[PDB]
A paper describes a structure:
Here, we report the first crystal structure of an ecdysteroidogenic regulator encoded by the Halloween gene, noppera-bo (nobo). nobo encodes a member of the epsilon class of cytosolic GSH S-transferases (GST, EC 2.5.1.18; hereafter GSTEs). DmNobo forms a polypeptide homodimer with a canonical GST fold, which has a well-conserved GSH-binding site (G-site) and a hydrophobic substrate-binding pocket (H-site) adjacent to the G-site. Consistent with the requirement of GSH for GST function, a defect in GSH biosynthesis in D. melanogaster also leads to larval lethality, which is partly rescued by the administration of 20E or cholesterol. In general, GSTs catalyze various reactions with an activated glutathione (GSH) molecule in the following three ways: GSH conjugation to a substrate, reduction of a substrate using GSH, and isomerization.
GSH and EST binding did not affect the overall structure of DmNobo; the root mean square deviation (RMSD) values for each pair among the four crystal structures were comparable with respect to the estimated coordinate errors.
Numbering used by the authors:
A (entry chain AA): 3 to 228
B (entry chain BA): 4 to 223
């Protein structure tokens, strides 16, 4: 019943997906900033709330959620009851769930491995070709999904698109989409949604933070901008 | 049409699905895909699942490529109204939150360790690094068990089935002796009839890892 509280750092793509859903559904939510690059997620009180030391973390009454994909489903079920973002029909809902788990286990995992290598080693010491292969593989899979539909999980916008677009925009700071016409079309369409504005500041903050910590510049030509 | 499960029982996410199939008496058709021979890269399997992973379930026209989606789908279709995937929203969110901890944290870190063994050889893995990453997962689970007998509340749910198989896999290398709640919970899980579905693939994974990584686990 009390309004949700979101612990967040907008540089995180999963955080941005929750910010996008909050904007799309017009949800009133208290924001509490946790600076991941300063290690504020290791403060004792935050660790007591979420021992995984991660954002987004949502506190909604007694419920404490520590994964973006649970937060997206929870907020859709509470603030979009009966809607199409988290579909009513079982098969369509399982397709969206399957895509959310692809984002967690495959796209995000590989982008996190790459970006954490940059922070830990410096960009000049990362095997960028290795990560390019891993992440281009994810682009190929997404292009294949979109060869069948204009959205990731079917013919309409779902939570899968909100979860995937933020991490895709993050991978695309580095790796261009010139060779992926369906992924370009979809990303352009997602950027026309008013809710996409919630992605913009955090993407830019992540770009700047990574350039500083990793001592490099992303190639400006890569990012798709409309 | 009955569900088809593409599987290699060495995979802990596969074992979680085998455990649920045994608990719910689901009639499935099993099709083996050998992960250590690279059969997940065969062209027909890749056409089905471009993430080249098991478990993969084909149920009618529905193709699921992640164990946590498979667990939820099978519970919804074959255990409607049961307690493994709770009806009440807050309880269900708690289960979902733990399934995603398993995917994003426990499994990710065990995968990173076990992959390192296969790629580099055990003698060349930074075991102390992986011990810190995996012990941190043990610490988190010990905290999750502070208030309840099971991972997501007072009774067995899908979260326990997902977590127990990967935990048993981490436990090939790293003992539970420092984590009393977690050790008690693991012993209780081993007493379930359905836990028998974990045993064969866990031992096969032990043997395959010891051969490929040229070592013996401490627990061996």
């Amino acid at each position: 019943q009390p309004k949700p509280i979101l612990y967040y750092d907008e540089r995180s793509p999963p955080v941005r997906s929750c910010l996008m859903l909050i904007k799309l559904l017009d949800i009133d939510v208290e924001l509490r900033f946790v600076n991941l690059f300063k290690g504020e997620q290791f403060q004792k009180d935050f660790l007591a709330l979420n021992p995984q030391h991660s954002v987004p973390t949502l506190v909604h009454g007694d419920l404490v959620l520590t994964d973006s994909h649970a937060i997206l489903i929870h907020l859709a079920e509470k603030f979009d009851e009966g809607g199409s973002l988290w579909p009513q029909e079982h098969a369509e809902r399982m397709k969206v769930l399957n895509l959310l788990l692809f984002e967690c286990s495959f796209l995000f995992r590989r982008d996190s491995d790459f970006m954490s290598a940059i922070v830990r080693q410096g960009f000049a010491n990362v095997d960028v070709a290795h990560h390019e292969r891993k992440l281009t593989e994810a682009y190929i899979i997404m292009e294949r999904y979109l060869e069948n539909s204009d959205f990731m999980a079917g013919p309409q916008l779902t939570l899968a698109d909100l979860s995937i677009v933020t991490t895709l925009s993050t991978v695309n700071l580095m790796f261009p989409l010139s060779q992926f016409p369906r992924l370009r079309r979809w990303f352009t369409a997602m950027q026309q949604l008013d809710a996409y504005e919630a992605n913009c500041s955090g993407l830019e903050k992540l770009r700047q933070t990574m350039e500083s910590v990793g001592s490099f510049q992303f190639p400006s030509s890569s990012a798709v901008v409309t």
